[PDB]
Design an enzyme around this catalytic site. Sequence first.
Site, short mmCIF file in Angstrom:
data_model
loop_
_atom_site.label_atom_id
_atom_site.label_comp_id
_atom_site.label_asym_id
_atom_site.label_seq_id
_atom_site.Cartn_x
_atom_site.Cartn_y
_atom_site.Cartn_z
N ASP A 59 -16.16 -23.88 -24.07
CA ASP A 59 -17.30 -23.28 -24.78
C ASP A 59 -17.34 -21.75 -24.89
OD1 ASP A 59 -18.04 -22.62 -22.23
OD2 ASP A 59 -19.87 -23.80 -22.18
N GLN A 61 -17.78 -19.64 -22.62
CA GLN A 61 -18.69 -19.09 -21.61
C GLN A 61 -18.00 -19.26 -20.26
OE1 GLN A 61 -21.86 -17.96 -23.17
NE2 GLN A 61 -20.32 -18.38 -24.76
N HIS A 142 -3.34 -1.16 -10.11
CA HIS A 142 -2.23 -1.01 -9.16
C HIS A 142 -1.10 -1.97 -9.54
CE1 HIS A 142 -0.64 -0.48 -4.88
NE2 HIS A 142 -0.03 -1.59 -5.27
N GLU A 143 -1.45 -3.23 -9.81
CA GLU A 143 -0.43 -4.23 -10.12
C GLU A 143 0.26 -3.93 -11.45
OE1 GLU A 143 0.28 -5.75 -7.59
OE2 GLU A 143 -1.62 -5.62 -6.52
N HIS A 146 2.83 -1.25 -11.25
CA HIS A 146 4.15 -1.64 -10.76
C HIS A 146 5.07 -1.96 -11.94
CE1 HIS A 146 3.86 -1.41 -6.45
NE2 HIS A 146 2.85 -2.27 -6.36
N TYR A 157 12.10 -0.63 -4.10
CA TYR A 157 10.93 -0.96 -3.27
C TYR A 157 11.23 -0.97 -1.78
CZ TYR A 157 6.18 -2.87 -2.79
OH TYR A 157 4.85 -3.07 -2.51
N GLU A 166 4.65 2.70 -4.33
CA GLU A 166 3.30 2.31 -3.89
C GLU A 166 2.25 3.37 -4.22
OE1 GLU A 166 1.40 -0.16 -2.58
OE2 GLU A 166 3.05 -1.23 -3.56
N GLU A 177 -9.70 3.36 -12.27
CA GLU A 177 -11.05 3.15 -11.76
C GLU A 177 -11.99 4.27 -12.21
OE1 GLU A 177 -11.48 1.51 -7.74
OE2 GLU A 177 -13.02 2.99 -7.31
N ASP A 185 -13.97 5.92 -6.76
CA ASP A 185 -13.72 6.59 -5.50
C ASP A 185 -12.22 6.73 -5.32
OD1 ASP A 185 -12.65 4.05 -4.49
OD2 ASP A 185 -14.75 3.42 -4.48
N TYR A 193 -12.20 -6.11 -0.58
CA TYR A 193 -11.75 -6.12 0.81
C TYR A 193 -12.90 -6.39 1.78
CZ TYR A 193 -9.04 -4.47 4.88
OH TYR A 193 -8.37 -4.37 6.09
N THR A 194 -12.66 -7.30 2.72
CA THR A 194 -13.59 -7.60 3.82
C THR A 194 -15.05 -7.67 3.40
OG1 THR A 194 -13.66 -5.27 4.52
CG2 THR A 194 -12.03 -6.69 5.59
N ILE A 197 -17.72 -6.64 5.88
CA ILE A 197 -17.75 -5.26 6.37
C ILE A 197 -17.98 -4.28 5.23
CG2 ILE A 197 -16.48 -3.46 7.61
CD1 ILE A 197 -14.77 -5.69 8.82
N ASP A 226 7.47 -3.98 6.48
CA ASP A 226 6.87 -3.60 5.20
C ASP A 226 7.87 -2.84 4.33
OD1 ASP A 226 4.80 -3.22 3.25
OD2 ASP A 226 4.22 -1.31 4.21
N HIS A 231 3.74 0.51 2.14
CA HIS A 231 2.28 0.57 2.05
C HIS A 231 1.66 1.46 3.11
CE1 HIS A 231 3.20 -3.35 0.07
NE2 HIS A 231 2.22 -2.98 -0.74
C1 LIG Z 1 -1.66 -5.96 1.28
C2 LIG Z 1 -0.67 -5.04 0.60
N1 LIG Z 1 -0.73 -5.18 -0.85
C3 LIG Z 1 -1.08 -4.17 -1.66
O1 LIG Z 1 -1.28 -3.03 -1.26
C4 LIG Z 1 -1.24 -4.50 -3.12
C5 LIG Z 1 -2.61 -5.13 -3.35
C6 LIG Z 1 -3.76 -4.18 -2.97
C7 LIG Z 1 -3.92 -3.07 -3.99
C8 LIG Z 1 -5.06 -4.96 -2.84
N2 LIG Z 1 -0.29 -5.51 -3.57
P1 LIG Z 1 1.30 -5.14 -3.93
O2 LIG Z 1 1.60 -3.76 -3.37
O3 LIG Z 1 1.58 -5.30 -5.48
C9 LIG Z 1 2.27 -6.39 -3.06
N3 LIG Z 1 3.69 -6.13 -3.18
C10 LIG Z 1 4.55 -7.14 -3.13
O4 LIG Z 1 4.24 -8.31 -2.95
O5 LIG Z 1 5.93 -6.81 -3.36
C11 LIG Z 1 6.95 -7.71 -2.92
C12 LIG Z 1 7.62 -8.29 -4.15
C13 LIG Z 1 8.81 -7.74 -4.62
C14 LIG Z 1 9.41 -8.29 -5.75
C15 LIG Z 1 8.84 -9.38 -6.40
C16 LIG Z 1 7.66 -9.93 -5.91
C17 LIG Z 1 7.05 -9.38 -4.79
CA LIG Z 2 -15.36 -4.53 3.00
CA LIG Z 3 -11.26 2.26 -5.42
CA LIG Z 4 -17.03 -22.55 -20.08
CA LIG Z 5 -14.91 1.89 -6.30
ZN LIG Z 6 1.78 -2.26 -4.65
#
Ligand SMILES: CCNC(=O)[C@H](CC(C)C)NP(=O)(O)CNC(=O)OCc1ccccc1
Ligand SMILES: [Ca+2]
Ligand SMILES: [Ca+2]
Ligand SMILES: [Ca+2]
Ligand SMILES: [Ca+2]
Ligand SMILES: [Zn+2]
EC number: 3.4.24.27
Length: 316
Positions: A59, A61, A142-143, A146, A157, A166, A177, A185, A193-194, A197, A226, A231
Amino acid sequence: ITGTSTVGVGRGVLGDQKNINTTYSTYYYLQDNTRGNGIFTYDAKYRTTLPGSLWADADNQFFASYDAPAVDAHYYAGVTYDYYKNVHNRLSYDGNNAAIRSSVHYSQGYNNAFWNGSQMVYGDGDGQTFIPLSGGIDVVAHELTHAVTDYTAGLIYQNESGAINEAISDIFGTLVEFYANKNPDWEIGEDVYTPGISGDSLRSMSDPAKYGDPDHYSKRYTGTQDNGGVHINSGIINKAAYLISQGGTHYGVSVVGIGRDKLGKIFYRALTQYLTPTSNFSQLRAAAVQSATDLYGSTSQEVASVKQAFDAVGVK
Ligand SMILES: CCNC(=O)[C@H](CC(C)C)NP(=O)(O)CNC(=O)OCc1ccccc1
Ligand SMILES: [Ca+2]
Ligand SMILES: [Ca+2]
Ligand SMILES: [Ca+2]
Ligand SMILES: [Ca+2]
Ligand SMILES: [Zn+2]
């Protein structure tokens, strides 16, 4: 799919109503034809096979709880597309209007989002560490950033190049944003996030150390976790970027802020004209200085501020 462009309405992850561009052919699909060669949003249905199914709705919506992450992934991809086109004259992530694809409801309790080399992917979170991650405009940008990086500088990476990769995603996530101008911000992921909190975030660009991330090269992580701290060490570059835009005195070094727009111009030019897959932090400094020189002149405040900011975070 082939159909006619339509406009649906729904609610995002945070309960806000927005219009979304859809396509009608029997069903209404999350396919926005108004931008490049389309923005397409898919349902991964709690599994890990990608992309899943192009999101279909009877629909037009989108107010169901299950719809919310799709609404936001779709809408915020549009905002991010607009930022790159309007601000940097870049058409989609490849510069040639590549179709933008996102899948939501990836896996179960999945506390992350990523670019898989071909598309964006968003978990729903486990309800404790994250709620569905497409609820954050900085996260979506962010995504998608990449993908931009992968098509341009190609920063590997891991280690320093990976930390720059990153930071570039955090920097443009934040600039997007601000572009949308809703509760902007210099924090990363605060909207998703969280939920239990208030006032926190996944990372801070203004003060990375508030979450134990380094804000000076002397505090860089050199271990293997990592991908060599991509990160974590991003905090060093995030801090430099924050200082370039907003100014401040950091470890005794004063930086004259030049504003977000100029930060964005300098880093976009660095990303697209100077950085390479193996660039380290020192090479990023040189690229940013050269970019500012190209844009504003060797004797400019902008160039002086780039140098000050990298000095402040211990990158020569
Ligand atoms: C928890 C850490 N993650 C992050 O910092 C952000 C998400 C944030 C912005 C919420 N996600 P991201 O930096 O894109 C995760 N990176 C990632 O999975 O790279 C590994 C990778 C490498 C190649 C192919 C697929 C995955
Ligand atoms: Ca939070
Ligand atoms: Ca932000
Ligand atoms: Ca719908
Ligand atoms: Ca914000
Ligand atoms: Zn990332």
